[PDB]
Coordinates of C-alpha atoms and ligand atoms in Angstrom, one line a residue:
Chain T
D3 CA 132.5 92.8 98.6
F4 CA 131.2 95.3 101.1
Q5 CA 134.6 96.8 101.5
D6 CA 134.4 100.6 102.1
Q7 CA 130.7 100.4 102.8
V8 CA 129.4 102.1 105.9
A9 CA 126.6 100.3 107.7
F10 CA 124.3 101.9 110.4
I11 CA 122.5 99.2 112.4
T12 CA 119.9 99.8 115.1
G13 CA 119.6 97.3 117.9
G14 CA 123.0 96.2 116.7
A15 CA 124.3 95.5 120.2
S16 CA 122.4 92.2 120.2
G17 CA 120.5 89.5 118.3
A18 CA 119.8 90.0 114.6
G19 CA 121.4 93.5 114.6
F20 CA 124.7 92.2 116.1
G21 CA 124.6 89.3 113.7
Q22 CA 124.4 91.8 110.8
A23 CA 127.2 93.9 112.3
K24 CA 129.3 90.7 112.3
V25 CA 128.3 89.4 108.9
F26 CA 128.6 92.7 107.1
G27 CA 131.8 93.5 109.1
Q28 CA 133.4 90.2 108.0
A29 CA 132.6 91.2 104.4
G30 CA 134.5 94.5 104.7
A31 CA 132.0 97.0 105.9
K32 CA 132.7 99.6 108.5
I33 CA 130.0 99.3 111.2
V34 CA 128.1 101.8 113.3
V35 CA 126.3 100.1 116.2
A36 CA 123.4 102.1 117.3
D37 CA 121.6 100.8 120.4
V38 CA 120.0 102.3 123.4
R39 CA 121.9 100.2 126.0
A40 CA 125.2 102.0 126.4
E41 CA 126.8 99.1 128.2
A42 CA 125.7 96.6 125.5
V43 CA 127.0 98.8 122.8
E44 CA 130.4 99.1 124.4
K45 CA 130.6 95.3 124.7
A46 CA 129.3 94.8 121.1
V47 CA 131.9 97.0 119.5
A48 CA 134.8 95.6 121.6
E49 CA 133.7 92.2 120.3
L50 CA 133.6 93.5 116.7
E51 CA 137.0 95.1 117.0
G52 CA 138.2 91.8 118.4
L53 CA 137.2 90.3 115.1
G54 CA 139.1 92.9 113.0
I55 CA 136.0 94.9 112.1
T56 CA 136.2 98.7 112.2
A57 CA 133.3 99.6 114.4
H58 CA 131.9 102.7 116.1
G59 CA 129.4 102.8 118.9
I60 CA 126.5 105.2 119.3
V61 CA 124.2 105.1 122.3
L62 CA 120.8 106.1 120.8
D63 CA 117.1 105.9 121.3
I64 CA 115.7 105.9 117.8
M65 CA 112.5 107.4 119.2
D66 CA 114.5 110.6 119.7
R67 CA 114.4 112.4 116.4
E68 CA 117.0 115.1 117.2
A69 CA 119.5 112.6 118.7
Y70 CA 119.0 110.5 115.6
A71 CA 120.1 113.6 113.7
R72 CA 123.1 114.0 116.0
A73 CA 124.1 110.4 115.3
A74 CA 123.8 110.8 111.6
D75 CA 126.1 113.8 111.9
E76 CA 128.4 111.8 114.2
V77 CA 128.6 109.1 111.5
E78 CA 129.8 111.5 108.9
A79 CA 132.3 112.9 111.3
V80 CA 133.8 109.5 112.2
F81 CA 133.8 107.8 108.7
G82 CA 133.7 110.9 106.5
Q83 CA 130.4 110.1 104.8
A84 CA 126.8 109.1 105.4
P85 CA 126.0 105.4 105.6
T86 CA 125.7 103.5 102.4
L87 CA 123.7 100.8 104.3
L88 CA 120.9 101.4 106.7
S89 CA 119.5 98.6 108.8
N90 CA 116.4 99.3 111.0
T91 CA 116.6 96.2 113.2
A92 CA 115.8 97.5 116.7
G93 CA 112.6 96.0 118.0
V94 CA 110.6 95.3 121.2
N95 CA 107.5 93.5 122.2
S96 CA 105.3 92.3 125.0
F97 CA 102.6 89.8 125.0
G98 CA 99.0 90.1 126.3
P99 CA 95.4 90.3 125.2
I100 CA 94.9 93.0 122.6
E101 CA 91.7 94.4 124.3
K102 CA 93.8 95.0 127.5
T103 CA 96.3 97.1 125.6
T104 CA 97.1 100.5 127.0
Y105 CA 98.3 103.8 125.6
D106 CA 101.8 103.2 127.1
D107 CA 101.9 99.7 125.5
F108 CA 101.0 101.4 122.1
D109 CA 103.5 104.3 122.4
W110 CA 106.4 102.0 123.4
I111 CA 105.8 99.3 120.9
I112 CA 104.6 101.5 117.9
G113 CA 107.3 103.8 119.0
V114 CA 110.2 101.4 118.5
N115 CA 108.8 99.2 115.8
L116 CA 107.3 101.9 113.5
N117 CA 108.2 105.5 114.6
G118 CA 111.8 104.4 115.1
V119 CA 112.1 103.3 111.5
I120 CA 110.4 106.4 110.2
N121 CA 112.9 108.4 112.1
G122 CA 115.6 106.3 110.5
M123 CA 114.2 106.9 107.1
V124 CA 113.7 110.6 107.4
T125 CA 117.1 111.1 108.9
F126 CA 119.2 109.2 106.4
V127 CA 117.3 109.1 103.1
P128 CA 118.2 112.6 102.1
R129 CA 121.8 112.2 103.2
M130 CA 122.2 109.0 101.2
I131 CA 120.6 110.7 98.2
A132 CA 122.9 113.7 98.6
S133 CA 125.9 111.4 98.7
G134 CA 125.1 110.4 95.1
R135 CA 126.4 106.9 96.0
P136 CA 124.6 103.6 95.5
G137 CA 123.2 102.3 98.7
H138 CA 120.7 100.0 100.4
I139 CA 118.1 100.0 103.2
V140 CA 116.8 97.0 105.1
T141 CA 114.2 96.9 107.8
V142 CA 113.8 93.8 109.9
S143 CA 110.1 93.7 110.5
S144 CA 108.2 90.4 111.2
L145 CA 106.1 87.7 109.8
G146 CA 103.4 89.1 112.1
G147 CA 103.3 92.1 109.9
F148 CA 101.5 90.0 107.4
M149 CA 98.8 88.9 109.8
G150 CA 97.3 90.6 112.9
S151 CA 97.2 88.7 116.2
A152 CA 95.3 88.9 119.5
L153 CA 98.4 88.5 121.7
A154 CA 100.9 90.5 119.7
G155 CA 98.5 93.1 118.4
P156 CA 100.4 96.4 118.6
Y157 CA 103.7 94.7 117.5
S158 CA 102.1 93.1 114.5
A159 CA 100.4 96.3 113.4
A160 CA 103.7 98.3 113.6
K161 CA 105.5 95.6 111.6
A162 CA 102.7 95.6 109.0
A163 CA 103.3 99.3 108.6
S164 CA 107.1 99.0 108.3
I165 CA 106.7 96.3 105.6
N166 CA 104.2 98.5 103.7
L167 CA 106.5 101.5 104.2
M168 CA 109.5 99.6 102.8
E169 CA 107.4 98.6 99.8
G170 CA 106.8 102.2 99.2
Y171 CA 110.4 103.4 99.6
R172 CA 111.7 100.7 97.2
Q173 CA 109.6 102.2 94.5
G174 CA 110.6 105.8 95.4
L175 CA 114.4 105.1 95.7
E176 CA 115.1 102.8 92.8
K177 CA 115.7 105.9 90.6
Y178 CA 118.5 106.8 93.1
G179 CA 120.3 103.5 92.8
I180 CA 119.3 102.8 96.4
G181 CA 117.7 99.4 96.9
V182 CA 115.2 98.6 99.7
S183 CA 114.4 95.3 101.4
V184 CA 112.3 94.2 104.3
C185 CA 113.1 91.0 106.3
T186 CA 110.2 89.3 108.0
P187 CA 111.4 86.7 110.5
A188 CA 109.1 84.1 112.0
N189 CA 108.8 85.1 115.7
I190 CA 105.2 84.3 116.6
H226 CA 113.9 76.0 117.4
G227 CA 113.8 79.3 115.5
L228 CA 116.4 80.7 113.0
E229 CA 119.7 81.7 114.6
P230 CA 120.8 85.4 114.5
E231 CA 123.8 84.7 112.3
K232 CA 121.8 82.5 110.0
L233 CA 119.2 85.3 109.6
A234 CA 122.1 87.8 109.2
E235 CA 123.5 85.8 106.2
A236 CA 120.0 85.7 104.7
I237 CA 119.7 89.5 105.0
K238 CA 123.1 90.0 103.4
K239 CA 122.1 87.7 100.5
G240 CA 118.9 89.7 100.1
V241 CA 120.9 92.9 100.0
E242 CA 123.1 91.5 97.3
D243 CA 120.1 90.2 95.4
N244 CA 118.3 93.5 95.9
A245 CA 115.3 91.5 97.0
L246 CA 112.2 93.3 98.3
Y247 CA 111.2 90.5 100.7
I248 CA 113.6 88.4 102.8
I249 CA 111.7 85.4 104.2
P250 CA 114.2 82.6 104.9
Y251 CA 111.5 80.3 106.5
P252 CA 110.2 77.7 103.9
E253 CA 107.8 76.5 106.5
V254 CA 105.5 79.6 106.6
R255 CA 104.5 79.4 103.0
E256 CA 101.3 77.4 103.5
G257 CA 100.0 79.7 106.2
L258 CA 100.8 82.8 104.2
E259 CA 99.0 81.5 101.1
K260 CA 96.0 80.7 103.3
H261 CA 95.8 84.1 104.9
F262 CA 96.1 85.9 101.6
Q263 CA 93.5 83.7 99.9
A264 CA 91.0 84.6 102.7
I265 CA 91.5 88.2 101.7
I266 CA 91.1 87.5 98.0
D267 CA 88.0 85.4 98.7
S268 CA 86.5 88.6 100.4
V269 CA 86.6 90.6 97.2
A270 CA 83.0 91.2 96.0
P271 CA 81.9 89.5 92.8
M272 CA 81.8 89.9 90.0
Chain X
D3 CA 67.3 96.0 112.4
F4 CA 69.7 98.5 114.0
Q5 CA 67.0 100.0 116.2
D6 CA 68.3 101.0 119.6
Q7 CA 71.9 100.7 118.5
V8 CA 74.2 103.6 119.2
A9 CA 76.8 104.3 116.5
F10 CA 79.9 106.5 116.9
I11 CA 81.3 107.6 113.6
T12 CA 84.5 109.5 113.1
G13 CA 84.8 111.8 110.0
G14 CA 81.0 111.4 110.0
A15 CA 80.4 115.0 108.9
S16 CA 81.4 114.0 105.4
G17 CA 82.0 111.3 102.7
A18 CA 82.0 107.7 103.8
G19 CA 81.4 108.6 107.4
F20 CA 78.3 110.7 106.6
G21 CA 77.1 107.9 104.3
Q22 CA 77.3 105.5 107.2
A23 CA 75.5 107.9 109.6
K24 CA 72.7 108.0 107.0
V25 CA 72.5 104.3 106.2
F26 CA 72.8 103.2 109.8
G27 CA 70.4 106.0 110.8
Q28 CA 67.8 104.9 108.3
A29 CA 68.0 101.4 109.8
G30 CA 67.1 102.7 113.2
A31 CA 70.5 103.6 114.8
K32 CA 71.0 106.6 117.0
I33 CA 74.0 108.4 115.6
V34 CA 77.0 110.2 117.1
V35 CA 78.8 112.3 114.5
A36 CA 82.4 112.9 115.6
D37 CA 84.4 115.2 113.3
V38 CA 87.0 117.9 113.8
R39 CA 85.2 120.6 111.6
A40 CA 82.6 122.1 114.0
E41 CA 80.7 123.7 111.2
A42 CA 80.5 120.6 109.1
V43 CA 79.3 118.6 112.1
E44 CA 76.5 121.1 112.8
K45 CA 75.4 120.8 109.2
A46 CA 75.7 117.1 109.1
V47 CA 73.5 116.5 112.2
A48 CA 70.8 119.1 111.0
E49 CA 70.7 117.0 107.8
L50 CA 70.4 113.8 109.7
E51 CA 67.6 115.2 111.9
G52 CA 65.9 116.4 108.7
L53 CA 65.8 112.7 107.8
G54 CA 64.2 111.6 111.0
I55 CA 67.5 110.2 112.5
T56 CA 68.3 110.9 116.2
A57 CA 71.8 112.3 116.0
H58 CA 74.2 114.1 118.3
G59 CA 77.2 116.1 117.2
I60 CA 80.6 116.1 118.8
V61 CA 83.4 118.3 117.6
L62 CA 86.5 116.1 118.1
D63 CA 90.1 115.7 117.0
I64 CA 90.6 111.9 117.4
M65 CA 94.4 112.6 117.9
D66 CA 93.5 114.1 121.3
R67 CA 93.3 111.2 123.7
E68 CA 91.7 113.0 126.6
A69 CA 89.0 114.7 124.5
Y70 CA 88.3 111.3 122.9
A71 CA 87.7 110.2 126.5
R72 CA 85.4 113.3 127.1
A73 CA 83.4 112.4 124.0
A74 CA 82.9 108.8 125.1
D75 CA 81.6 110.1 128.4
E76 CA 79.5 112.6 126.5
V77 CA 78.0 109.7 124.5
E78 CA 77.0 107.9 127.7
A79 CA 75.4 111.1 129.1
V80 CA 73.3 111.8 126.0
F81 CA 72.2 108.2 125.0
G82 CA 72.6 106.5 128.4
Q83 CA 75.1 103.9 127.2
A84 CA 78.3 103.4 125.4
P85 CA 78.2 102.9 121.6
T86 CA 77.3 99.5 120.4
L87 CA 78.8 100.4 117.0
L88 CA 82.2 102.1 116.5
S89 CA 83.3 103.3 113.1
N90 CA 86.8 104.6 112.7
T91 CA 86.3 106.3 109.3
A92 CA 88.1 109.7 109.6
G93 CA 91.1 109.9 107.2
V94 CA 93.4 112.3 105.6
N95 CA 96.1 112.2 102.9
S96 CA 98.5 114.2 100.8
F97 CA 100.4 113.1 97.7
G98 CA 104.1 113.5 97.0
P99 CA 107.4 111.5 96.6
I100 CA 107.9 109.2 99.6
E101 CA 111.6 110.3 99.9
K102 CA 110.5 113.9 100.3
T103 CA 108.3 113.1 103.2
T104 CA 108.8 115.1 106.4
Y105 CA 108.1 114.5 110.0
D106 CA 105.1 116.8 109.9
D107 CA 103.8 114.8 106.9
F108 CA 104.2 111.6 109.0
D109 CA 102.8 112.9 112.3
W110 CA 99.6 114.3 110.6
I111 CA 99.0 111.3 108.3
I112 CA 100.0 108.5 110.7
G113 CA 98.3 110.6 113.4
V114 CA 94.8 110.5 111.8
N115 CA 94.9 107.2 109.9
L116 CA 96.6 105.1 112.7
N117 CA 96.9 106.9 116.0
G118 CA 93.4 108.1 115.7
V119 CA 92.0 104.6 115.4
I120 CA 94.2 103.3 118.3
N121 CA 92.7 106.2 120.4
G122 CA 89.3 105.0 119.2
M123 CA 90.0 101.4 120.2
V124 CA 91.5 102.1 123.6
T125 CA 88.8 104.6 124.5
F126 CA 85.8 102.4 123.6
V127 CA 86.7 98.7 123.8
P128 CA 86.7 98.5 127.6
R129 CA 83.4 100.4 127.8
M130 CA 81.8 98.2 125.1
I131 CA 83.0 95.2 127.0
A132 CA 81.8 96.5 130.3
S133 CA 78.4 97.1 128.8
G134 CA 78.0 93.4 128.4
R135 CA 76.1 94.0 125.2
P136 CA 76.9 92.6 121.7
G137 CA 78.6 95.1 119.5
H138 CA 80.7 95.8 116.4
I139 CA 83.7 97.8 115.2
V140 CA 84.5 98.9 111.7
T141 CA 87.6 100.7 110.5
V142 CA 87.6 102.2 107.1
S143 CA 91.2 101.7 106.0
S144 CA 92.2 101.5 102.4
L145 CA 93.3 99.1 99.6
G146 CA 96.6 100.9 99.8
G147 CA 97.0 99.2 103.2
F148 CA 97.6 96.0 101.2
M149 CA 100.4 97.5 99.1
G150 CA 102.9 100.3 99.8
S151 CA 103.3 103.1 97.3
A152 CA 105.8 105.8 96.4
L153 CA 103.3 108.7 96.3
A154 CA 101.0 107.7 99.2
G155 CA 103.7 106.2 101.4
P156 CA 102.7 107.4 104.9
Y157 CA 99.0 106.9 104.2
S158 CA 99.4 103.4 102.9
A159 CA 101.6 102.4 105.8
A160 CA 99.1 103.7 108.4
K161 CA 96.3 101.9 106.6
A162 CA 98.3 98.6 106.5
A163 CA 98.6 98.9 110.3
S164 CA 94.9 99.6 110.9
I165 CA 94.0 96.6 108.7
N166 CA 96.5 94.4 110.7
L167 CA 95.3 95.9 114.0
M168 CA 91.6 95.0 113.1
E169 CA 92.7 91.5 112.2
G170 CA 94.0 91.3 115.8
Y171 CA 91.0 92.8 117.6
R172 CA 88.6 90.5 115.7
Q173 CA 90.4 87.6 117.3
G174 CA 90.5 89.2 120.7
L175 CA 86.9 90.4 120.9
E176 CA 85.0 87.4 119.4
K177 CA 84.8 86.0 122.9
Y178 CA 82.9 89.2 123.9
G179 CA 80.3 88.9 121.1
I180 CA 81.9 92.0 119.5
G181 CA 82.6 91.5 115.8
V182 CA 85.3 93.5 114.0
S183 CA 85.6 94.4 110.3
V184 CA 87.9 96.5 108.2
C185 CA 86.8 98.2 105.0
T186 CA 89.4 98.7 102.3
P187 CA 88.1 101.1 99.6
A188 CA 90.0 101.6 96.3
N189 CA 91.3 105.1 96.5
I190 CA 94.7 104.9 94.7
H226 CA 84.5 106.8 88.6
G227 CA 85.0 105.4 92.1
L228 CA 82.4 104.0 94.4
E229 CA 79.9 106.5 95.8
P230 CA 79.8 107.2 99.6
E231 CA 76.3 105.8 100.0
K232 CA 77.2 102.7 98.0
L233 CA 80.2 102.1 100.2
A234 CA 78.1 102.8 103.2
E235 CA 75.6 100.0 102.2
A236 CA 78.5 97.6 101.7
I237 CA 79.8 98.4 105.2
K238 CA 76.4 97.8 106.8
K239 CA 76.2 94.5 104.9
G240 CA 79.6 93.5 106.2
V241 CA 78.5 94.4 109.7
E242 CA 75.5 92.2 109.4
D243 CA 77.5 89.4 107.9
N244 CA 80.3 89.9 110.5
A245 CA 82.8 89.9 107.7
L246 CA 86.5 90.5 108.6
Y247 CA 87.2 92.2 105.2
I248 CA 84.9 94.5 103.3
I249 CA 86.2 94.9 99.8
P250 CA 83.3 95.9 97.5
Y251 CA 85.5 96.4 94.4
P252 CA 85.5 93.2 92.1
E253 CA 88.0 94.9 89.9
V254 CA 91.0 94.8 92.3
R255 CA 91.1 91.0 92.7
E256 CA 93.7 90.5 89.9
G257 CA 96.1 93.0 91.3
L258 CA 95.7 91.8 94.9
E259 CA 96.4 88.2 93.9
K260 CA 99.5 89.3 92.0
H261 CA 100.9 91.3 94.9
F262 CA 100.3 88.5 97.3
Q263 CA 101.9 85.9 95.0
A264 CA 105.1 88.0 94.7
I265 CA 105.4 87.7 98.5
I266 CA 104.7 84.0 98.5
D267 CA 107.3 83.6 95.7
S268 CA 109.8 85.2 98.0
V269 CA 109.6 82.5 100.6
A270 CA 112.9 80.5 100.7
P271 CA 112.7 77.0 99.5
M272 CA 112.4 74.2 100.4
Ligands
NAI301 O1 116.7 89.0 118.4 P1 116.3 90.5 118.3 O2 115.2 90.6 117.3 O3 117.4 91.3 117.8 O4 115.8 91.0 119.7 P2 116.7 91.5 120.7 O5 115.9 91.8 122.0 O6 117.8 90.4 121.1 O7 117.5 92.8 120.3 C1 116.9 94.1 120.3 C2 117.7 95.3 120.3 O8 117.0 96.4 120.1 C3 117.4 97.4 121.0 N1 116.4 98.5 121.3 C4 115.3 98.4 122.1 N2 114.7 99.6 122.2 C5 115.5 100.5 121.5 C6 115.4 101.8 121.2 N3 114.3 102.6 121.8 N4 116.3 102.5 120.5 C7 117.3 101.7 120.0 N5 117.5 100.4 120.2 C8 116.6 99.8 120.9 C9 117.8 96.6 122.2 O9 118.7 97.3 122.9 C10 118.3 95.4 121.7 O10 119.7 95.6 121.6
NAI302 O1 85.4 110.3 101.4 P1 86.2 110.3 102.8 O2 87.1 109.1 102.9 O3 85.3 110.3 103.9 O4 87.1 111.6 102.9 P2 86.6 113.0 103.3 O5 87.7 114.0 103.2 O6 85.4 113.4 102.4 O7 86.1 112.9 104.9 C1 87.0 112.9 105.9 C2 86.5 113.3 107.2 O8 87.5 113.1 108.2 C3 87.6 114.2 109.0 N1 88.8 114.4 109.8 C4 90.0 114.8 109.3 N2 90.9 114.9 110.3 C5 90.3 114.6 111.5 C6 90.7 114.5 112.8 N3 92.0 114.9 113.2 N4 89.8 114.1 113.7 C7 88.5 113.8 113.4 N5 88.1 113.9 112.1 C8 89.0 114.3 111.1 C9 87.3 115.3 108.1 O9 86.7 116.4 108.8 C10 86.3 114.8 107.2 O10 85.0 115.1 107.7

């Protein structure tokens, strides 16, 4: 079903990224695990190979644009083609009062959660297009991207951008047979990494723009959106 | 009504920024015009002084964090206090296919429309808090911040973040008597800079979170938001 697909997953050495490596892997995909923790990568790929998944490990900080370019080249060297599935899953956060936020807080958190995914998009989109093969791109953002917050301020803002940015690329890339989705998990008991992974794979199959496997958030989301609509000036 | 308020306006040498300088100025506010075009600043302040507004000009690229800090100091030197009104209005854009976007496109556009306003917030928020005076903060974002697009991709994403970020700071700063608003103009015939300026001043008075003086967009916004709500997994 995903046989002879190549999937490039950031933050794939853990959590939702690893879950995706596993779930896509079990469907037949060749996996590239891109993560910044060299030790965790090593482990993650051993464990994937243990499961009969063909998997390559790339230690990478997605905030480094030129290494991200080396990786992309590396992927073509190893598997003989650019990825046909890109997953921007790597994320980081830290909690505290939004007024107390510092430049380093911003650079780190905006860095991983927004600039990282831009780097992902700029690196791979032209290669995926030049391949002339169908493809797909998923970004795991966050429910916080739909609503700013006083304790996860920088994180929420970056996620709001990555959601909006995926909305854009969906429109741009449809003409290339490349679908685009954004997953917004509820991280504000809690959906397991493999359960979320299966939701994402389903969304990829369905070519869904939004992947929101949390029936419980609907009320809150409707409320937040109505508050905006109510703000529109009459008449 | 705004007498003995000090207002710091980015991109105030033109368009919606200048409109605000004028409208706040005519209400009694002392104005700081912060803009990157030294010539346009000079002109803008001459024209404000011509109108009986006390106005100071600061040539500034809001992407420079340390100059933004020099400015803030400069403001306290000139008017003897930190601003009691911050307006992050400076913006830039360029149109083209989102897949063709380049790093320089991203750095410039994310730079002004998001990083600029972060720099604005980090610089002034502590000073405004330390003043122990009531205050207010407005960011002029965009309607595109509510919905990603294939031709204004980077711009829309940055604006989505600045909206979300203001949502956050509103919550954080309420306990400090500092209100926060975000204005989202429809720039996707068109509302005049002074008309938008008056809408913003009203929103500041009303302490409104959202300032959306465009009755016509309501249908589209409701539609976009419903599409998201419809994506939430049953049950
Ligand atoms: O559950 P989850 O949402 O997965 O959270 P998580 O914390 O379990 O997983 C996050 C993953 O993102 C990775 N990561 C953090 N910073 C990175 C960077 N600069 N470049 C590449 N990868 C990075 C981490 O190594 C980690 O493996
Ligand atoms: O109508 P409008 O929305 O006002 O559009 P506009 O184009 O008329 O006004 C935008 C303002 O933002 C300013 N600007 C652009 N880049 C800047 C930067 N890096 N730092 C500070 N100011 C900058 C411009 O000088 C301009 O005055």
